[PDB]
Structures are given as C-alpha cells and as structure tokens.
Amino acid sequence: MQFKLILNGKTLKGVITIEAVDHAEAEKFFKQYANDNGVDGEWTYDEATHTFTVTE
C-alpha cells in the first residue's frame, strides 16, 4: 500500500512515494533510502497519512 516519506534535511528536500506491504516494509525501506543518500535523523510518523518524515 501507498506509504510516503518526506526527507526534510539540510541541503536536500524530498518526497518519496512507494507501495510497500505495511508500516514494517515501508519503514525499513525508508531507513535505507535516507541512509543511502545521506540524511539521518529522527523519524516522525503520521498514520493518518501513511507518511513517514525524517528531519535533520
């Protein structure tokens, strides 16, 4: 299902949409996306939006 992640970092801004199976898959997938492109921070999650964000 549709899960979204907002990469609100220093240099880069972003919004990614995926169709992962659940909160579990979407979560690890986004931990790895943010890590691979160099934004790491605290993760916020709204379950009304199915939207993760990571803020630096």
Residues in touch with its own copies (CB under 8 A): 22-24, 27-28, 42-45, 47
Q: What's the angle, vertex CA 16, arms to CA 54 and CA 2, rounded to 5?
A: 105
Least distance CB 11 / Ni ion (angstroms)? 26
Cβ-based nearer residue to Ni ion, 10 or 49: 49
Cα–Cα separations (whole angstroms), residue 24 to 4, 10, 11, 53: 13, 26, 28, 15
Q: Which of residues 15-54 bind Ni ion (CB under 5 A)?
A: 27
Q: Would you say 36 or 42 has its CB closer to its own copies? A: 42
